[PDB]
Design a protein around this nucleic acid. Structure first.
Ligand SMILES: [Mg+2]
Ligand SMILES: [Zn+2]
Lengths: 225, 124, 94, 453, 350
RNA sequence: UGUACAACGGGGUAUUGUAAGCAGUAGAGUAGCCGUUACGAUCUGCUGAGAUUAAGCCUUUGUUGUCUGAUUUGU
RNA sequence: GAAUGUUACCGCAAUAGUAAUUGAACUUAGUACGAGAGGAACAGUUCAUUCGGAUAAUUGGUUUUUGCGGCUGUCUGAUCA
């Protein structure tokens, strides 16, 4: 399941894509090599929606969601929202959350049961996200990192955080999330583990820079096998 | 429309915090007789740290512009601009020194620098 | 389309016209032309300008299947709103 | 620098280098000067030409000096290897001679420039320039042999191996023609000749293999003959130096068979005399060509010699063969375990009372068949469609019309998105009659309210 | 370093005529039917089109983009004659010319200068030769069949039908792309006095080149280091190539401005009207980019003289909306309905 | 001597911002009596009104006036 | 401005000048070559600096609309216009 994959010439897989347990987003630009690479592991179980967000190829960070729904920033155009609605499954809902922040994937990280949000996020947006995803919401930061989603990665299995996290912070995050937590690294020590790669309960994708020890750590924490 | 000219004292945009930076040099500049380099939004430039952290002072590092403040005609007909010129600092491969960013970032700079986009929360 | 109405004058801003401006506040400023842009830049509240729509509203001046079904709604709503505005203008004269 | 200094600019011989320098000076400088020109201008031109030639020569010499690996203090292992390969003393002397020639060229150029600015007649300046050029050529002329030797060693140095002794390494060593070259070829993804003569791998070939998610490099060497430490060849001296300097145990091979026709007593005595090399390496011994000997069926007298090998502390006798490489897996596993032990000895969810979840892998992925890329009977992988369409250059991605909706006609319907008024999305909702049924009543009650008559 | 322009464009004296003469014509492909090589018209003004494009591998692929486009007036045209040329060592020489004798007053005015003072002694005298059972035009056709291996048709613009009212029309030669000159001359003879449709000569996404005269600027005549020891700008013929046609403007009917997406029923006529121009009411061609000259200036449309296989030409447009706001100032609405909706009723309304 | 021409005003479209005056006498306060009376900034309706009405934007089957005045050239 | 008996239209060209330039994102590529380090270009698309030909719808300065409304002081006896 854990297979090495690369963008055109970028190791930031999660910037241009955002894999989920029931759907996957990929930038329309480039070539179908990324699309076919994701299809190989994903087969044809769920639709792989080629789509853009506000005309950018960073849709992976702009948007965020879970199995029960997908959230997009207000900057998203009407055509993109319509395409997402007509391509995503009926269970997944989409809405034009009217809040100041834009990068849901960077500012917010969540899984099918637990979601972390910015401490300053508006109450209405928090309630909407909770209703859409069917998950609990908690105000937290990873060792003072304002961009929780840019460093923290979380699925139903164990989670991964950037190495700078302290032992006490790692333990607190694991306790709050009720998931195994290991302070691993990806893309040759890159600190963008929360946004430079994608992973879910069955599939893990990362750049070629991920060394064999890093792949082994990812497999052990996520227990793909 | 190109951005600030050479030597503009632009403000820092990273979370580490710096008073300002001096653009001593530009990369991919349009070298032409009487036409000085003008760093535009999203272009990686070598700018010295005029003021800031004591260790960062008196050394040139690659600065990535995140704001332009000037009117530029994007492929979209809207002539948008920003409050003031600002730019983050990163290594030649875009590895931003700071762990966060200050202020919003534009789509033009985010697209060219995936690391910067991952390092910013208020995009566009 | 997502054509935005000028937050100052409430008038439509077609693509390619006007200017969209943002500051460090992460709030999008939209102006249909230079006049309203400069008026907002001067902190002039729209309630102080007679021509802007906000003052008129405040002062009582002028108070496949889915697409096929909604075709009728636009014209009906436009006509009803025009009739209401005309009626309001009739009593406006005194 | 280190790690394959091949980047040296492979300087041409002395004659070729001098010809190139002279051609560059002639081409990059003016040539047509006349007696009628002012004396100051002619002198300035001659001085400029002389300075250009001197600067070119100095730059060439400085680049040559800098490009070299800086043998001094680089590394004891690398220093000894270079000394064996190129006779360090001669290389240092040649570099010193080159530096002296560069200094002499600098001094000559400075002296001629100082003198050149006083000649009055154009002929005097021409003669001074010619004398300067002749002096420079004569200085360069004597440098032919050192330059040729340096070019040869550079041609050899560029292709020398590149490994760091400080890193984790395991090597293979033993008598020549023991199958050690075959063992190196099989154990690691490296190609080396396996010809059956006692000097197959003359050069110290480097092999690389991975185990326990870590890279483990290896080297090769023909080994050592009797060699009582007085009469040794360069190849064997390189092996001795590598064994002395290198890191954790090097595998000692022994051909217990008719091949390698030295009595097993000689093989035992070789390692017994080499014992001082085993200060802290925890040496390991592997018997090669075990297939055609089966050391279990060995003479008691010969077995005693093998037993004596086990007597020295920290040794093992593992069986290995070349025809069948199954033993190579165990050999590499044991070597890596010993290496890790030597390198090491040198030194939660919390069940928060409320969370309930199950692994939410979709049933589709659970029951879908595994994909096979090489198998022709596989999914389309529309990347293939793109490739046959002409790649991304002309492939018009058409994922549109292929999304889930209520009916198949909606796939091609072009959404208008505009109807002469603000987009319907602001009010686009099913059952639009909810905003039309009351409009008739509103119109009636606005018309019959006296607001229009 | 570069200089103050291109030496190949100098000297830059004033053009000898307002109408830009065609320097060359596309190669005559005999296998193709009898089509028209070029067209002539007057450009009205500029407008902005917002649309998406199918450009795989591009940064803006699948994203909507706004590009500068222009509208060129091209009402129906009627053929007035045919001209044949024979290859000679001195070059192509005009053999003979023919006329239908059914010439409108526009070409008569063009031929004359003081039409009001003119006695109006038009071609009638020569036409009297043709006004018979024939055998004269038959002789001309036989002469142009035995010789004149290259034939150029003569057409005149319907200046009277142009929104900008005028009485004098332009006249220019146009070549044919048909088979052997027999078919060319037969088609020309059959099409005498017949209306010519613009859409029949062009199509969507077609790449075309144009020639026109740039705006004049009057007399345009310091460093004292120019010579060694040992004065007009504008009003000159200029050529431009690689222009993509977005849509053929059937301006004789409504819905031309609105696209299949917006379907905002209206014409391309900008609110209030084009600056220093009338109100389009006939066929027109929509072409991206810009063309030299100004409004009311005659322009020529040609299909680049060669066929192009680049993906840029192959790519098709997906027009979603066309801007038609009032260009007379800071326009804000496309039709009077939008202005009335924004401002509601006014004093003039009651 | 014909959609003939130019002007007039309108319409369409834009620039700017609520026109002279009238009135609801509404009315911050100034002056008399010792809270009230006279004057009245300012708002409100005529009035997104007025002006520009491109002097260099388009139309005018509506109104007005004219459709005349000189000179040169020959196979 | 005499050309060529007169006028106007259509065109050919004898002749003079000549221009485009350079780089990069992918595809093929993390494949050939590589024990490792590192790593292409041959095809097609897509972008970019300078320069050449043009403008004029979008954007900055330049404003003789004296155009709009107003501000300081003077004048037709403050205010009319
Ligand atoms: Mg051998
Ligand atoms: Zn506005």
């Amino acid at each position: 399941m854990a297979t090495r994959t690369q963008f055109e010439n970028s190791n930031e897989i999660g910037v241009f894509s955002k894999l989920t347990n029931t759907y996957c987003l990929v930038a329309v630009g480039g070539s179908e090599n990324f699309y076919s690479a994701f299809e190989a592991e994903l087969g044809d179980a769920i639709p792989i929606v080629h789509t853009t967000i506000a005309g950018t190829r960073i849709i992976g960070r702009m948007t965020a969601g879970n199995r029960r729904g997908l959230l997009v920033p207000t900057q998203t155009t009407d055509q993109e929202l319509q395409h997402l609605r007509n391509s995503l499954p009926d269970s997944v809902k989409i809405q034009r959350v009217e809040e100041r922040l834009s990068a849901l994937g960077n500012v917010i990280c969540c899984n099918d049961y637990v979601a972390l949000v910015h401490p300053d996020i508006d109450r209405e947006t928090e309630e909407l996200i909770s209703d859409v995803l069917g998950v609990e919401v908690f105000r937290q930061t990873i060792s003072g990192n304002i961009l929780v989603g840019s460093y923290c990665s979380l699925s139903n299995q164990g989670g991964l955080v950037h190495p700078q996290t302290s032992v006490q912070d790692q333990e607190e995050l694991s306790s709050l999330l009720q998931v195994p937590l290991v302070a691993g690294t990806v893309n040759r020590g890159s600190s963008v583990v929360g946004a430079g790669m994608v992973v879910n309960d069955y599939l893990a994708v990362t750049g070629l820079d991920t060394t064999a020890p890093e792949l082994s750590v990812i497999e052990s924490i996520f227990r793909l096998q | 429309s190109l951005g600030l000219p050479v030597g503009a004292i632009m403000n820092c945009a990273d979370n580490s915090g710096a008073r300002n930076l001096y653009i001593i040099a530009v990369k991919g500049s349009g070298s032409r007789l009487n036409r000085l380099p003008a760093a535009s939004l999203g272009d990686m430039v070598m700018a010295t740290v005029k003021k800031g952290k004591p260790e960062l002072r008196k050394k040139v590092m690659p600065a990535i512009v995140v704001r332009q403040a000037k009117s530029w005609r994007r492929r979209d007909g809207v002539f948008l601009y920003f409050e003031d010129n600002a730019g983050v600092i990163a290594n030649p491969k875009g590895e931003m020194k700071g762990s966060a960013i200050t202020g919003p970032v534009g789509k033009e700079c985010a697209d060219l620098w995936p690391r910067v986009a991952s390092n910013s929360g208020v995009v566009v | 389309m997502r054509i935005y109405q000028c937050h100052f004058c409430s008038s439509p801003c077609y693509p390619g016209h006007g200017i969209m401006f943002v500051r460090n506040d992460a709030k999008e400023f939209r102006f249909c032309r230079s006049k309203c842009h400069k008026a907002f830049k001067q902190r002039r509240n729209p309630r102080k300008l007679k021509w802007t729509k906000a003052f008129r509203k405040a002062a009582g001046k002028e108070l496949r299947e889915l697409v096929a079904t909604t075709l009728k709604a636009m014209a009906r709503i436009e006509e009803i709103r025009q009739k209401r505005e005309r009626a309001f203008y009739k009593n406006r004269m005194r | 620098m280190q790690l394959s200094w091949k980047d040296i600019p492979t300087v041409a011989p002395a004659n070729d280098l001098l010809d190139i320098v002279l051609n560059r000076t002639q081409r990059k400088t003016p040539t047509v000067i006349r007696p009628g020109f002012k004396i100051t201008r002619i002198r300035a031109f001659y001085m400029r030409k002389v300075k250009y030639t001197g600067e070119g020569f100095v730059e060439k010499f400085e680049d040559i000096l800098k490009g070299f690996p800086n043998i001094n203090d680089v590394h004891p292992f690398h220093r000894d290897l270079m000394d064996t390969l190129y006779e360090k003393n001669h290389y240092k002397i040649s570099l010193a001679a080159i530096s002296r020639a560069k200094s002499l060229v600098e001094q000559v150029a400075r002296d001629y420039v100082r003198l050149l600015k006083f000649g009055q007649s154009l002929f005097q300046c021409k003669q001074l320039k010619r004398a300067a050029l002749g002096r420079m050529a004569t200085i360069v002329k004597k440098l032919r042999d050192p330059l040729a030797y340096l070019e040869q060693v550079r041609q050899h140095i560029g292709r020398l191996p590149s490994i760091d002794p400080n890193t984790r390494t395991l090597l293979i060593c033993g008598y020549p023609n023991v199958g050690k070259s075959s063992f190196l070829r099989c154990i690691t993804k490296s190609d080396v000749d396996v010809q059956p003569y006692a000097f197959t791998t003359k050069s110290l070939y480097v092999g690389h293999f991975d185990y326990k998610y870590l890279r483990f490099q290896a080297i090769d060497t023909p080994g050592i003959l009797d060699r009582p430490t007085e009469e040794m060849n360069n190849i064997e001296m390189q092996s001795i130096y590598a064994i002395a300097h290198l890191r954790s145990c090097v595998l000692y091979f022994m051909d217990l068979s008719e091949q390698c026709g030295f009595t097993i007593e000689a093989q035992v005595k070789l390692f017994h005399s080499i014992k001082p090399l085993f200060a802290n390496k925890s040496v390991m011994v592997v018997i090669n060509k075990t297939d055609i000997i089966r050391p279990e069926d060995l003479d008691e007298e010969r077995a005693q010699l093998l037993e004596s090998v086990k007597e020295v502390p920290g040794v093992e006798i593992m069986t290995s063969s070349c025809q069948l490489e199954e033993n190579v897996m165990e050999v590499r596993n044991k070597a890596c375990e010993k290496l890790l032990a030597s390198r090491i000895e040198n030194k939660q969810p919390q069940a928060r009372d409320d969370v309930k979840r199950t692994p939410f892998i979709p049933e589709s992925v659970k029951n879908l068949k595994k994909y096979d890329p090489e198998d022709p009977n596989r999914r389309k992988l529309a990347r293939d469609i793109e490739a046959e369409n002409g790649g991304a250059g002309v492939f018009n991605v058409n994922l549109k019309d292929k999304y889930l909706l209520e009916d198949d006609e909606w796939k091609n319907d072009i959404m208008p998105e505009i109807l002469d008024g603000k987009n319907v999305y602001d009010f686009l909702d099913p059952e639009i009659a909810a905003k039309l049924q009351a409009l008739e009543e509103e119109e009636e009650k606005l018309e019959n309210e006296g607001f229009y008559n | 370093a570069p200089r103050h322009g291109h030496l190949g464009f100098l000297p830059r004296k004033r053009a000898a005529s307002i109408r830009a003469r065609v320097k060359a014509f596309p190669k005559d492909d005999r296998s193709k039917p009898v089509a028209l090589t070029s067209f002539l018209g007057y450009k009205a003004g500029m407008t902005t089109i917002v649309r998406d494009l199918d450009r795989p591998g591009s940064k803006f692929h699948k994203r909507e983009v706004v590009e500068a486009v222009t509208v060129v007036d091209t009402p129906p045209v009627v053929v007035v004659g045919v001209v044949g040329y024979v290859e000679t060592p001195r070059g192509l020489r005009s053999l003979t010319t023919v006329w239908a004798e059914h010439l409108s007053d526009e070409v008569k005015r063009r031929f004359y200068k003081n039409w009001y003072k003119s006695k109006k002694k038009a071609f009638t005298k020569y036409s009297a030769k043709y006004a018979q059972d024939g055998a004269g035009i038959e002789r001309e056709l036989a002469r142009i069949k035995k010789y004149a291996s290259v034939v150029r048709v003569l057409v005149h613009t319907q200046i009277r039908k142009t929104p900008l009212a005028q009485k004098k029309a332009h006249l220019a030669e146009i070549q044919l792309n048909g088979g052997s000159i027999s078919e060319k001359v037969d088609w020309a003879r059959e099409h005498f006095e017949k209306t010519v449709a613009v859409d029949s000569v062009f199509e969507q996404n077609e790449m075309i080149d144009a020639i026109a005269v740039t705006k004049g600027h009057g007399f345009e005549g310091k460093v004292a280091c120019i010579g060694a020891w040992h004065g007009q700008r504008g009003y000159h013929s200029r050529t431009s190539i690689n222009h993509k046609i977005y849509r053929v403007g059937k301006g004789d009917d409504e819905a031309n401005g609105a696209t299949s997406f917006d379907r905002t029923k209206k014409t391309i006529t900008p609110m209030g009207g084009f600056v220093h121009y009338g109100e389009i009411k006939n066929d027109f061609i929509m072409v991206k980019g810009c063309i030299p000259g100004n409004r009311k200036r005659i322009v020529t449309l040609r299909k680049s003289l060669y066929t192009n296989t680049s993906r840029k030409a192959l790519e098709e447009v997906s027009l979603k909306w066309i801007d038609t706001a009032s260009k007379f100032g800071k326009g804000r609405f496309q039709t009077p309905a939008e202005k009335h909706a924004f401002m509601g009723t006014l004093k003039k309304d009651l």
